[PDB]
Structures are given as structure tokens and as C-alpha cells.
Amino acid sequence: PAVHLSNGPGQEPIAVMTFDLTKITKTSSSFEVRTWDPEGVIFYGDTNPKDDWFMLGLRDGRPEIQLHNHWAQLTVGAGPRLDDGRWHQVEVKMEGDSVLLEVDGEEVLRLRQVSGPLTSKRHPIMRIALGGLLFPASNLRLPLVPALDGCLRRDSWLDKQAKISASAPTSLRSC
Amino acid sequence: PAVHLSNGPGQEPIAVMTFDLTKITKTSSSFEVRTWDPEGVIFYGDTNPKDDWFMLGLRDGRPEIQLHNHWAQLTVGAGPRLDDGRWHQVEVKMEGDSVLLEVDGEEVLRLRQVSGPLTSKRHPIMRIALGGLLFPASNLRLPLVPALDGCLRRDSWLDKQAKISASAPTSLRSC
Ligand SMILES: c1ccc(-c2[nH]c3ccccc3c2Cn2ccnc2)cc1
Ligand SMILES: c1ccc(-c2[nH]c3ccccc3c2Cn2ccnc2)cc1
Ligand SMILES: [Ca+2]
Ligand SMILES: [Ca+2]
């Protein structure tokens, strides 16, 4: 059962979830995606949309990560083209101080020294948005057009035991 | 005709070249490498070893780039394992504000927004060192042991028309 990653012309995400970082023990997510679209947002996350945020998307058909926090600020593309209309397995893992991206079972990117332990300075509420950003696309380090005409399935996001809230699922469209 | 990327126990590079950045028109390099060694430095470059430097190497058999300048500071791993004893084609290209890494004809990494135009503030003399760093390994963002027991061939470095000096080639060892 797959859901569309874009619902109409607007750039708003199709789903938002909120997590308690003080309770999280699983810092990875996994999903399958299929698209003919070379550009868009797969997911966005933040503890503060001004000061601590990240984005996984596609640009020129390839994975792109942008992130901005006090440890690191970067815009990186990596991995194979995903816009070939086949299902691809994606996993994003925060391990130690590093973020790992795996595509179809292969590690394609490791961003080192981009994260740290949870400090009382870090706001302990993390949002995850699917298919869109929680700020205007112009606040990205490198703007793109967020709409991603693709399908998502088999998706697991961080640690369900730490989830505080999730948007209503009746706004979702089956593929 | 290939040359060894490590000459003895010391960590010093096997070759150094110097370029005039005011004259450079080709900002890419290409080479083939073969190694069973999972860790080490392939090349290092700088305009200032304190303030503006970069490194391409291997860690856990995979390409790693570290760079440190006023625009960007990062430590990133990407691409396939290269420590399988086969020759691999590598190309590193500075294009616009981005650095591209290609391995065996495939783009595996694009670091965006890491470079800018040549400004009078930027020291216009760039050094490139092969097989070692031009500072102690402890000054890396993430230390590694620089020695890379591998072989290098078919190597072209930046723009030979901008080259000011190059170390003596009789210190090189054939593979
Ligand atoms: C690009 C850049 C950073 C991240 C990121 N920052 C994090 C901060 C805290 C916990 C997990 C993560 C993840 C990993 N993550 C987030 C949702 N699913 C996995 C993710 C993608
Ligand atoms: C990792 C990070 C940065 C770079 C880099 N910074 C540069 C600054 C000015 C011109 C070319 C380059 C290159 C590209 N380059 C340098 C030698 N051969 C190609 C290279 C590797
Ligand atoms: Ca799109
Ligand atoms: Ca080594």
C-alpha cells in the first residue's frame, strides 16, 4: 500500500510527525520510493526551523541532503539516479556523530561530524515532514521546487515509541 | 607506468606541485589508483595549511574528502570501496561553487556551495601533494593514518600551464 508524495499544486507536506528526542532510541528511518520526477523533497526534519533542520530530497534525479545546525551546514548530492520509475530502498541512519545514507542496500554517503549528543540546549521536540518543508523553499541553503511526484511505501520513521503526534491519515492518497 | 603512493614508513608525500591560481583554467584532475589498503591519503591541497586546505583519501576502503576554508568545513565519505586490488578511474572537478567526485565513470559525490571565485583575499598559490599531507595528520578534521600502500598511474593534475614548480621525479618508485 503506497501513498502519493504530492497532493495537489501546493508545496505543503503530505504528513507531519513529532518525536520526543529525550525518548528516542532508534535514530534511523527506512522507506521505498518510486518516481519519474528529478527534483523534490522526500522528507524534512527539524528541532527549530531557524537553527536546526535537515532535508532529504532529489536534485537532477539523485539524492541530495541539506542540513543546518550549530555543528554543520552543508548541501551534498550523492548516490545513483532514482528517477527511473523503479522502487528503491532508502535508509537514513544517524550513527554517533554521522549521518549515513543507504540506497538499494549500498552505503552511498556518510556525513561525518554533523551531529552530537542530546544537550539541554537542543530543543527536544523533532518534527518530520514527508513530501514538503516546514518553511518556504527560499530558506533552503540551495532552493529547489519541493513537489515530488512519486510514491512512498514500506516506510518506518525513527522510533514509534517516541512519537508524540502524527497528522491525520485521511488526507493521504493511494497510488 | 605506475608509481608507488608510499615511499617508506614516513608519512611525507611522494610528490608536491605548485600552481598559480591566477593562471589556472582547468580545475580538475584525473588518475587511476589500485590498492589493497583501506586507509590513507591520495592527495592533499592548500592555499594555506591553516585556513584553506582539502584532502582526498580512503577510509574503510571508500573515498573520503575533508576540506576546511572560510566557505565550508566538512568530512564526507562516498562512493564504492576501492581497496579491491583493481585499477579505478578517479576524477575530481571543481565546477562553479561545487566539487564533483567521479569513480569509474560514475558521479558519486557533489559537494555544493564549497568554493567561490578567486578573490584578492585568497592566497593565489596552490600546492598539491600526492600520497601525504603538508601538515601533521592530527590537524585533519578527522585524523587518519596517511600512508596509502597503492599505485598511481595515468595522472593529470589541474592545469600544467599554471604549474610553477614540481618536486624531483627521481624520488619516485615504479610499481
Ligand atoms: C539528513 C540529515 C540529518 C538527518 C538526521 N538528523 C537527526 C537528528 C537526530 C536524530 C536523527 C537524525 C537524522 C536521521 N533521520 C531523521 C529522520 N530519519 C532519520 C537525516 C537526514
Ligand atoms: C576535494 C576538495 C576540494 C578540491 C578542490 N579545491 C579546489 C580549489 C581550486 C581549484 C580546484 C580545486 C579542487 C579540485 N581539485 C584539486 C586538485 N585537483 C582537483 C579537491 C578535492
Ligand atoms: Ca518535482
Ligand atoms: Ca594505509
Side-chain angles (χ1 to χ4, degrees), chain B residues 18-39:
Chain B
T18 301
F19 299 84
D20 180 350
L21 286 185
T22 74
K23 286 190 165 185
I24 198 181
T25 63
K26 181 173 184 188
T27 54
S28 60
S29 290
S30 60
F31 59 88
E32 289 177 6
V33 64
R34 181 183 61 181
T35 189
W36 294 103
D37 192 341
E39 185 170 308

Side-chain angles (χ1 to χ4, degrees), chain B residues 37-40 145-149:
Chain B
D37 192 341
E39 185 170 308
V145 179
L148 188 62
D149 299 304

Side-chain angles (χ1 to χ4, degrees), chain A residues 19-20 23-26 157-159 161-164:
Chain A
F19 299 84
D20 180 350
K23 286 190 165 185
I24 198 181
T25 63
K26 181 173 184 188
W157 305 99
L158 293 177
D159 181 354
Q161 294 318 127
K163 191 174 304 178
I164 302 173

Side-chain angles (χ1 to χ4, degrees), chain A residues 19 21 24 26-31 43-45 47 52-56 64-69 71 74 91-95 98-101 111 114-116 118 122 126-128 156-158:
Chain A
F19 299 84
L21 286 185
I24 198 181
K26 181 173 184 188
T27 54
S28 60
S29 290
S30 60
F31 59 88
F43 72 85
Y44 163 99
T47 69
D52 179 23
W53 61 265
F54 52 86
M55 188 272 306
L56 175 67
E64 176 172 291
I65 289 177
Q66 290 179 44
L67 62 88
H68 173 99
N69 58 59
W71 287 297
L74 52 82
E91 194 154 5
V92 191
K93 312 173 191 178
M94 200 289 296
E95 302 205 356
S98 307
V99 172
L100 291 54
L101 177 68
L111 308 175
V114 298
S115 210
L118 191 75
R122 178 171 224 201
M126 173 175 286
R127 299 189 294 181
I128 301 291
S156 179
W157 305 99
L158 293 177

Side-chain angles (χ1 to χ4, degrees), chain B residues 26 31 33-34 55 58 63 69-70 87 95-96 99 114 128 132 149 173 175:
Chain B
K26 181 173 184 188
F31 59 88
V33 64
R34 181 183 61 181
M55 188 272 306
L58 298 185
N69 58 59
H70 83 88
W87 286 105
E95 302 205 356
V99 172
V114 298
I128 301 291
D149 299 304
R173 291 194 300 113
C175 276

